[PDB]
Amino acid sequence: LDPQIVISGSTAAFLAIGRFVFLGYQRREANFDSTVGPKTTGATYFDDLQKNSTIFATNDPAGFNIIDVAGWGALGHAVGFAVLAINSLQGANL
Amino acid sequence: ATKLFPKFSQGLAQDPTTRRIWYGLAMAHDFESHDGMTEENLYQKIFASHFGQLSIIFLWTSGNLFHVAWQGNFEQWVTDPVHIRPIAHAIWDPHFGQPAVEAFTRGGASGPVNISTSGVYQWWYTIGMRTNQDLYVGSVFLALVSAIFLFAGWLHLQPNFQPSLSWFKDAESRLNHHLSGLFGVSSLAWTGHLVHVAIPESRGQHVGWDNFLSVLPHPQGLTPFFTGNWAAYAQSPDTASHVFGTAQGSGQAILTFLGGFHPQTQSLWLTDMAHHHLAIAVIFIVAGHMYRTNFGIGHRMQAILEAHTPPSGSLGAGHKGLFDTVNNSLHFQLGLALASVGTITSLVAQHMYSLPPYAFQAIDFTTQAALYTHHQYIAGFIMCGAFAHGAIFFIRDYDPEQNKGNVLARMLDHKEALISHLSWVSLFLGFHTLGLYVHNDVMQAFGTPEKQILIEPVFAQWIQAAHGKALYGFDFLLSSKTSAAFANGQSLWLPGWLDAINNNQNSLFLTIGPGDFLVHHAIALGLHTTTLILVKGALDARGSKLMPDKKDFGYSFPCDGPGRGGTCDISAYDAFYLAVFWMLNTIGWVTFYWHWKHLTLWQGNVAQFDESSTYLMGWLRDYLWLNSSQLINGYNPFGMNSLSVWAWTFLFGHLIYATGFMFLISWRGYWQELIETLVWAHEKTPLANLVYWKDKPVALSIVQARLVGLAHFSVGYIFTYAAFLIASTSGRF
Amino acid sequence: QAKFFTQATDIISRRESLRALVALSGIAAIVTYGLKGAKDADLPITKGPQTTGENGKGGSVRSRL
Amino acid sequence: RPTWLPGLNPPAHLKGALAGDNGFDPLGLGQDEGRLKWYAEAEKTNGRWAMMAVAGILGQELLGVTPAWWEAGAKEYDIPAQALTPIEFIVMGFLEIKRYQGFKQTGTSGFINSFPFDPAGMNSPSMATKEVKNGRLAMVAFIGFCVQALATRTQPIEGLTAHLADPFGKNITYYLTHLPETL
Amino acid sequence: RPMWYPGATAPAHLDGSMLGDYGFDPLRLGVNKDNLKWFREAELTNGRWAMAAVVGILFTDAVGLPKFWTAGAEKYALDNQTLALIEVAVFAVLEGKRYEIYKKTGETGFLSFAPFDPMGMKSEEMKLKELKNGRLAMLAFLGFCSQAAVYGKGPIETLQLHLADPGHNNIYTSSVGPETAVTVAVLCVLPMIIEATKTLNPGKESVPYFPWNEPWN
Amino acid sequence: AAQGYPFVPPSWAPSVFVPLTGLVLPAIAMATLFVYIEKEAP
Numbered sequence A: 001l002d003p004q005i006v007i008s009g010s011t012a013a014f015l016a017i018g019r020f021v022f023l024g025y026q027r028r029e030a031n032f033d034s035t036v037g038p039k040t041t042g043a044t045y046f047d048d049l050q051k052n053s054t055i056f057a058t059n060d061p062a063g064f065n066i067i068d069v070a071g072w073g074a075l076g077h078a079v080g081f082a083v084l085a086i087n088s089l090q091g092a093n094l
Numbered sequence B: 001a002t003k004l005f006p007k008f009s010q011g012l013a014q015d016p017t018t019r020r021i022w023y024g025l026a027m028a029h030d031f032e033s034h035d036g037m038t039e040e041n042l043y044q045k046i047f048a049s050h051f052g053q054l055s056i057i058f059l060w061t062s063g064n065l066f067h068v069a070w071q072g073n074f075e076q077w078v079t080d081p082v083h084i085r086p087i088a089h090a091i092w093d094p095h096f097g098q099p100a101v102e103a104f105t106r107g108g109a110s111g112p113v114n115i116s117t118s119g120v121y122q123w124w125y126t127i128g129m130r131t132n133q134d135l136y137v138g139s140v141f142l143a144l145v146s147a148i149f150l151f152a153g154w155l156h157l158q159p160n161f162q163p164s165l166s167w168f169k170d171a172e173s174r175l176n177h178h179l180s181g182l183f184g185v186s187s188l189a190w191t192g193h194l195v196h197v198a199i200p201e202s203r204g205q206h207v208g209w210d211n212f213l214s215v216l217p218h219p220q221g222l223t224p225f226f227t228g229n230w231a232a233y234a235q236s237p238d239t240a241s242h243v244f245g246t247a248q249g250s251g252q253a254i255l256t257f258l259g260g261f262h263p264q265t266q267s268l269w270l271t272d273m274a275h276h277h278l279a280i281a282v283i284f285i286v287a288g289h290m291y292r293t294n295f296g297i298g299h300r301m302q303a304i305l306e307a308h309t310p311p312s313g314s315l316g317a318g319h320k321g322l323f324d325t326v327n328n329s330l331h332f333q334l335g336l337a338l339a340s341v342g343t344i345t346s347l348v349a350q351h352m353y354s355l356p357p358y359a360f361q362a363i364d365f366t367t368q369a370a371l372y373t374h375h376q377y378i379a380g381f382i383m384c385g386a387f388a389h390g391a392i393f394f395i396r397d398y399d400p401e402q403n404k405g406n407v408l409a410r411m412l413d414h415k416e417a418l419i420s421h422l423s424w425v426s427l428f429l430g431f432h433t434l435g436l437y438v439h440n441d442v443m444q445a446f447g448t449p450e451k452q453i454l455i456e457p458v459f460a461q462w463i464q465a466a467h468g469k470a471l472y473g474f475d476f477l478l479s480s481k482t483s484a485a486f487a488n489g490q491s492l493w494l495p496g497w498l499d500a501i502n503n504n505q506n507s508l509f510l511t512i513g514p515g516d517f518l519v520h521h522a523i524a525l526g527l528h529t530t531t532l533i534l535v536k537g538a539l540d541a542r543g544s545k546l547m548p549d550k551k552d553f554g555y556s557f558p559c560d561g562p563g564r565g566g567t568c569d570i571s572a573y574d575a576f577y578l579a580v581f582w583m584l585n586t587i588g589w590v591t592f593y594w595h596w597k598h599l600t601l602w603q604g605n606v607a608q609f610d611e612s613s614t615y616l617m618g619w620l621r622d623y624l625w626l627n628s629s630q631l632i633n634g635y636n637p638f639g640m641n642s643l644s645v646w647a648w649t650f651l652f653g654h655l656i657y658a659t660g661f662m663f664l665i666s667w668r669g670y671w672q673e674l675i676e677t678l679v680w681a682h683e684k685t686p687l688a689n690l691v692y693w694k695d696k697p698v699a700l701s702i703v704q705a706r707l708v709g710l711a712h713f714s715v716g717y718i719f720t721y722a723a724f725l726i727a728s729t730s731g732r733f
Numbered sequence C: 001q002a003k004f005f006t007q008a009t010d011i012i013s014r015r016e017s018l019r020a021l022v023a024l025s026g027i028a029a030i031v032t033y034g035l036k037g038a039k040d041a042d043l044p045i046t047k048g049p050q051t052t053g054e055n056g057k058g059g060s061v062r063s064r065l
Numbered sequence D: 001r002p003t004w005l006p007g008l009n010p011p012a013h014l015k016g017a018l019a020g021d022n023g024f025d026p027l028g029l030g031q032d033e034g035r036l037k038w039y040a041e042a043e044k045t046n047g048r049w050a051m052m053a054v055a056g057i058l059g060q061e062l063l064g065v066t067p068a069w070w071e072a073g074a075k076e077y078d079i080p081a082q083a084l085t086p087i088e089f090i091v092m093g094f095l096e097i098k099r100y101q102g103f104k105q106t107g108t109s110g111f112i113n114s115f116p117f118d119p120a121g122m123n124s125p126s127m128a129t130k131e132v133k134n135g136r137l138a139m140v141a142f143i144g145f146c147v148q149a150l151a152t153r154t155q156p157i158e159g160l161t162a163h164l165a166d167p168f169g170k171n172i173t174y175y176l177t178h179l180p181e182t183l
Numbered sequence E: 001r002p003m004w005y006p007g008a009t010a011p012a013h014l015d016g017s018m019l020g021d022y023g024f025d026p027l028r029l030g031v032n033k034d035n036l037k038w039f040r041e042a043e044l045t046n047g048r049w050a051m052a053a054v055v056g057i058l059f060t061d062a063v064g065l066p067k068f069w070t071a072g073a074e075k076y077a078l079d080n081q082t083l084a085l086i087e088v089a090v091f092a093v094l095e096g097k098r099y100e101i102y103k104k105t106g107e108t109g110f111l112s113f114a115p116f117d118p119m120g121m122k123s124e125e126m127k128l129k130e131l132k133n134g135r136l137a138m139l140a141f142l143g144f145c146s147q148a149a150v151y152g153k154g155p156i157e158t159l160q161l162h163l164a165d166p167g168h169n170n171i172y173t174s175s176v177g178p179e180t181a182v183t184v185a186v187l188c189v190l191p192m193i194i195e196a197t198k199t200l201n202p203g204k205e206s207v208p209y210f211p212w213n214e215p216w217n
Numbered sequence F: 001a002a003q004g005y006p007f008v009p010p011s012w013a014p015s016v017f018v019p020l021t022g023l024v025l026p027a028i029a030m031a032t033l034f035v036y037i038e039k040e041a042p
């Protein structure tokens, strides 16, 4: 069953459809700074824990940082392990 | 003149009467009404009080553990749990006579003890605890955790550790961390405990901190996990010949989906619960990655809420402006939390009796009864508080301008429709339930029980048959051995589930009949009328036709005077106080039904309930009167037994209840004049006018009268029924 | 007599001293009552059951220990 | 400055003032300044204890001590642990209350009354960078020691020898599997 | 001045005005000044009696005499009730003169010499030495009784037992071992919590909410 | 305790702590929370 094949393929497919397919949609959706403004305008330490203290710059041209990577690879690992587990009991219901 | 005690109120500190003491006792935790209260200081004091509540909870658990270890029989109960009674703690009462020292010597103890109706023995035996040293160490650890939370509550009140107002109003991060870590990683760690400790200890293998790094939870350690061969963790489950706590019929699996019950313990499989918490942990961890934090991804709850505006304007503005309303109102959050927590407390009660999670539970009948009644009354109180705080929100926190046209304002817009329809459902259910019960009573009185209205609950029976109960012959979904729902589960939970649900000696989907129909409709009447009172106090909270400016008078206030026809019990607080009676009656019906159904099941006489629950003289004769015999004979002119304490507590609760009647019927104005006469008497009595009061005696206020009467009422209700329940279940079993 | 009783109370004639005496006396009294005085009074809770008690008679149906 | 991500600008609260600044505060934990000073001292203290700890584990393994570093507690010495622990609490409480009384004032490290301790004149910002970097390395190295010996598994140099004998057959992928063979 | 733990800050009432002041009043028992004077005198009285008792016990255990927890059971020239009556009668007048001397002087005296100081060695250095040796001897008698109750041996016999095997014959291997180990660890970590309180509230004092303290003022 | 588990309460513990918890600590508490209630503010 080659779990390396399965999980590498799931992660690669999800990273691909996150980079090439659903990146524009996710950027259109995640741009909430709108009526929906910042959580805090204050200068307290606890107001700073809610600000984006570190913008994750990426030299990827489409803007695919370690957070997009983390998310799409997490979905890929989850789906690959789902495939492996549903194959683990050598069958499915219907 | 000006006193010192109600530091949070200068108006109470300047009050020269006894009302100052009471109201400072009862306004202490209404932080918003405190003098000089800022919203930030409010949230910070709430945070500290939450730390204190956690510390108290962990100390209480530490004390339970400590007393079960020190004065309990846990090391003997694990040997013969079906036959040995669990000791709660020892009794040292110098008022005891020798007959009482002899009568309360139970459970193999050396002296007088209390028998645990708590279930903590079954719980701790199921999760791997076998010795008294385990419980001792757990109690020490939980006392340390309590001290740690106390220190945290002190610390986060200090200047450089007091969080900002916005840190509390950060909902996305709190939700992410509380779903992912507090719910999810906690469930993952509990799965780890079950896989490493509880399941091996149920297989007879001792796993503790001394050796848990040296024993494998599975013979194939973590290879099935990192290779995706997860079914290897379900290969050899525990057999049907398995005896809990031993290796005879052990099994090697740690994650199963067997379904049903462990046959020897009549409890859930520990591997099923491990897999349960693993699945739930994964689901909650991925759920806690939903909301937006400092990393650029995720949702903003404001966007989700403001986007969910239906077209057709069927909800108006929809959920526009609702994020601000929920996030800025602590009473909205508290009402939502109490609603959910009470609903899931009722879920706990309804599922722990049908699917007993703990070993040798469901054979400890007193424990089952006590747990169900406990969690259902807790749930009823919590659910009354949910609506109470919803009303407090509508009064204190609701801004009609910032909720212009959204679902929340759309509620108040058609509140008369809601209240009148709840009125219709309550009225219908009461009329017809009481009428059918009275018809059946009259028919049994005239000796013609074949003329009763015995409506078969075919809808709930159809549901039961959809779950695989083959007693009714519906043959629909899982009772149909040819359906796809049945076929697709046969490799899975369904064999165990269907062996467990068709066994009529457990409580998994009990057989129901017309008595169950009638009492379920009584339960519905109770729910509908309780929520009628509560919804009507929550929606008429900001004003009515009788009192349109009610929001200006607060949540609690005595009345608006005898003008405009009379305005007694006008406030939302009074609606809550009226709904607590109906809640207690609802949960009393619920727990009566539960206890009688299960008493007739445990006695092998289900026909008694099936034949006597269709009329209320059967409830009075065959449940309340029949089961009271051993209870009221706890002490008699011919001696006493261990039910003496429950007889005493029975009479105690009756007394408290009746005393509450004093504060509920008799109102302030008789007592103020009586107290004036007593004041005169004391000021004019020689040798006693030397002693004088510092706080002027006054009768209890109207709101305080209602509170104290409801408190005596509820405490008596609760103590009476707990005494009766334990004494009627512990007397037979 | 008045001198005797003004001097007997000389040490406890202040609130703090009297409450210290009361605390000392009451705590000592309850502690010696639990340790020694309850057994000296021959209390049934200090003697023990003197019997097998209600041990094996759990319920009328299930005679549990 | 070279930052932990290529092309990344370091956050605002992280100047190059402190020793080992590489712009690494993705959680933003050091955005308070007094807490950042306390966390700098905490980094230095955890790093010093981890440096001495990995030094002690490697000097226990390179030298001939009887048990593993993770079994040295379960060992009979001339003093029982029940009596060892309170002596250690006394001594280390003295030392740590003297260290803390000396971080309130002097805002710096030190031994008992010397803040900074520095008997030798080797103080330097480059030396502070080296301290914090070797301390981070030793912290990671001790968590390595612990997770690498999570059950009765290799000792540190034993594990390094095992990896150098057969690299593609003795690594984490072999040992997270074949765990029943180890226990 | 030195403190009871390094870098402690004394409370408001322990101004250093008194001798042996190390700022140790965590339960705030001495916030009243009359109570504080009475407690200084009681400290000194318990300390004097404990010094005499410590040297008496060390003497009686150094020579061939019965152990001090059994000496009351031995047989003497007078029956125990006559002894108790003579002791009560003597100490009534003795402690009455001492009580009058405290009400007048504020300090100690035997009967009529308000300061019992034939040899005029009443420095304040000597008052400090009295107080310190008295605290030490109070601890010493507490230890005498404690390690004669844990064992059935006297003070120097327990000392010899310790010196025979110091690592295994000590308080943490005794019947009271674990409780003392835990209380020692708690005591050693306690001052860091106290210094946290002093640090997070710079220069502020927190009332511990006790009865004797009148913490509402 | 001897060796089973340390910090086990003595046999006489209830006889002391039930009076303490029920007669003394409530007396202390009610006296203190009576002086504090009737205390006038300056």
Ligand code: CLA
Binding pocket: B025, B026, B027, B028, B029, B030, B031, B334, B338, B381, B382, B383, B384, B385, B386, B388, B389, B392, B555, B556, B573, B576, B711, B715
């Ligand atoms: C998470 C739970 C939670 C939280 C945080 C709060 C918090 C609050 N509630 Mg809410 N509430 C809750 C649950 C909660 N409540 C539930 C479950 C109910 C329904 C029972 C209510 C019903 C409710 C009402 C009706 C009101 C509040 C009010 C308040 C506020 C102040 C209450 C006060 O001063 O306490 C003081 C409380 C007491 C002094 C306790 C009274 C005594 C009770 C009855 C227990 C007595 C037990 C007794 C000792 C047992 C004896 C047995 C023995 C003899 C054997 C505060 C914001 C009030 C408010 O906001 O006013 C605007 C208000 O009017 N709450």
Ligand code: CLA
Binding pocket: B423, B424, B426, B427, B428, B429, B430, B431, B434, B525, B529, B532, B533, B578, B579, B581, B582
């Ligand atoms: C046995 C006691 C009892 C009974 C019968 C009721 C009955 C009722 N309560 Mg509850 N209530 C009670 C105790 C009781 N209450 C207590 C102790 C309190 C605390 C103060 C409350 C507080 C309370 C509140 C706050 C609310 C109610 C409501 C209701 C009504 C709910 C609808 C319903 O069931 O209609 C069915 C009706 C009945 C069961 C009673 C009528 C009985 C028969 C069917 C009528 C005909 C009998 C006969 C022919 C009359 C002959 C008269 C003459 C010829 C002699 C109903 C009238 C709600 C309400 O009124 O809104 C709808 C509501 O909001 N009650």
Ligand code: CLA
Binding pocket: B655, B658, B659, B660, B661, B662, B665, B666, B670, B674
């Ligand atoms: C069981 C319910 C109950 C109880 C106990 C009481 C009790 C009382 N009522 Mg009330 N009353 C009730 C129901 C009740 N009423 C109801 C339902 C109504 C209809 C509205 C009234 C209407 C009413 C009116 C109109 C009047 C009273 C009066 C009285 C008092 C007269 C008896 C008295 O003082 O004797 C002494 C006290 C008792 C007998 C109560 C029981 C106490 C026992 C002996 C236990 C003692 C406990 C002990 C101190 C231990 C303490 C424990 C410690 C930890 C706290 C007393 C306070 C009258 C009054 O106050 O004037 C005198 C009065 O005028 N009541």
Ligand code: CLA
Binding pocket: E136, E139, E140, E142, E143, E144, E146, E147, E150, E158, E159, E161, E162, E169, E170, E171, E172, E174, E176, E180
């Ligand atoms: C200055 C007083 C003093 C001195 C010198 C000693 C000395 C001794 N005690 Mg004793 N002891 C004392 C006070 C003292 N104790 C007190 C107050 C208590 C009650 C808690 C006890 C209770 C006690 C028990 C139950 C046992 C000992 C034992 C011992 C011996 C081993 C050390 C040990 O583990 O105890 C450590 C003692 C404590 C943790 C109690 C607190 C001690 C305080 C902090 C004083 C510390 C010394 C002081 C700072 C400077 C010494 C001055 C000078 C003599 C150099 C040793 C001979 C053991 C023994 O006999 O083994 C054979 C034993 O089993 N002691």
Ligand SMILES: CCCCCCCCCCCCCCCC(=O)OC[C@H](COP(=O)(O)OC[C@@H](O)CO)OC(=O)CCCCCCCCCCCCCCC
Binding pocket: C015, C016, C017, C019, C020, C022, C023, C026, C027, C029, C030, E211, E212, E213, E214, F020, F023, F024, F027, F028, F031, F032, F033, F035, F036
């Ligand atoms: C180990 C056992 C548990 C110990 C717990 C702590 C003990 C507390 C000891 C208090 C010492 C005296 C306080 C000095 C008094 C003092 O400092 O006053 C402070 C405070 C009141 O302050 P005031 O306003 O009166 O002070 C003004 C004056 O100081 C003049 O300025 O005291 C109280 O509130 C009442 C406390 C009563 C405490 C005694 C209660 C008695 C308990 C015994 C009950 C026995 C019942 C059974 C009988 C058979």
Ligand SMILES: CC1=C(/C=C/C(C)=C/C=C/C(C)=C/C=C/C=C(C)/C=C/C=C(C)/C=C/C2=C(C)CCCC2(C)C)C(C)(C)CCC1
Binding pocket: A011, A069, A070, A071, A072, A073, A074, A075, A077, A078, A079, A081, B282
């Ligand atoms: C250089 C470059 C490249 C490449 C790159 C790469 C290759 C990357 C990768 C990346 C990656 C490769 C990533 C990954 C990620 C991953 C992740 C993120 C994971 C996660 C996981 C998780 C989350 C898990 C979970 C879980 C568990 C733990 C167990 C079971 C259950 C579950 C599954 C749920 C190219 C050629 C294109 C070009 C451009 C540039």
Ligand SMILES: CC1=C(/C=C/C(C)=C/C=C/C(C)=C/C=C/C=C(C)/C=C/C=C(C)/C=C/C2=C(C)CCCC2(C)C)C(C)(C)CCC1
Binding pocket: B331, B332, B333, B334, B335, B336, B339, B340, B343, B386, B387, B389, B390, B391, B393, B535, B538
């Ligand atoms: C007053 C107020 C308040 C409160 C309120 C409340 C308290 C409410 C409650 C509510 C509630 C308490 C609700 C409940 C609900 C429930 C539900 C909604 C359920 C559902 C269910 C379902 C949906 C199911 C499904 C299923 C079934 C049927 C079975 C099987 C499985 C499944 C899943 C298929 C607040 C604060 C908000 C504010 C405003 C005002």
Ligand SMILES: CC1=C(C/C=C(\C)CCC[C@H](C)CCC[C@H](C)CCCC(C)C)C(=O)c2ccccc2C1=O
Binding pocket: B662, B663, B664, B666, B667, B668, B669, B671, B672, B698, B699, B700, B701, B702, B705, B706
């Ligand atoms: C009896 C009665 C009184 C008189 C009762 C008095 C004034 C209050 C009773 C106080 C005495 C001291 C008894 C208190 C006993 C409680 C056990 C005290 C517990 C409180 C602590 C928790 C603080 C009223 O003032 C009243 C007012 C309005 C409606 C109904 C009534 C009413 O029924």
Ligand code: SF4
Binding pocket: B558, B559, B560, B561, B562, B566, B567, B568, B569, B667, B702
């Ligand atoms: S005092 Fe009572 S009767 Fe009078 S208006 Fe108020 S609630 Fe109504």
